[PDB]
């Protein structure tokens, strides 16, 4: 997958060691089909591809988080769009985390506080703010 050095992972994922939980991930659910299409895609991913996503993810926080500051609802145009923006970013970055799939991530993310703590490192409750943004976004699209 990532096949990076502790130093690259640091320059790329910051103070986050995903590799250590590589095989540990499947322990949680390890039953998805998407993950199969992703592994094929992440098979050769390099630090660049991985860093490209981080700088991209950082951007996601300021705007999302900034929305929170303004006190605007998550199902707001700006928020939901942000959600649709997240979708295409994580989808084209692994295989194509569809809308229905993108949602599965939203909530299954609130369950494990390990993700939250690592994700919320930017701000508490962000996970909830995104899920609703993604959920709503999926609704306006859903037939």
């Amino acid at each position: 997958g990532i096949n990076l050095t502790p130093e690259e992972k640091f320059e790329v994922f910051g103070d986050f060691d995903p590799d250590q939980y590589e095989e540990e991930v499947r322990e949680r659910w390890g039953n998805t089909d998407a993950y199969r299409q992703s592994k094929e895609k992440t098979a050769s991913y390099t630090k660049e591809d991985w860093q490209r996503i981080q700088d991209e993810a950082d951007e996601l926080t300021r705007r999302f988080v900034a929305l929170m500051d303004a006190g605007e609802p998550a199902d707001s145009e700006g928020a939901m769009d942000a959600a649709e923006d997240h979708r295409q970013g994580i989808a084209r970055n692994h295989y194509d985390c569809g809308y229905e799939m993108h949602t599965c991530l939203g909530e299954m993310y609130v369950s494990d506080e390990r993700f939250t703590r690592n994700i919320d490192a930017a701000k508490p409750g962000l996970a909830a703010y995104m899920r609703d943004a993604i959920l709503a976004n999926a609704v306006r699209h859903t037939p």
Binding site: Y35, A57, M101, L105
Partner: peptide, 11 residues
């Protein structure tokens, strides 16, 4: 899907 710890997935 796609990782266990911040953002990709499978469900």
């Amino acid at each position: 899907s796609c990782v266990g710890x911040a953002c990709a997935x499978x469900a």
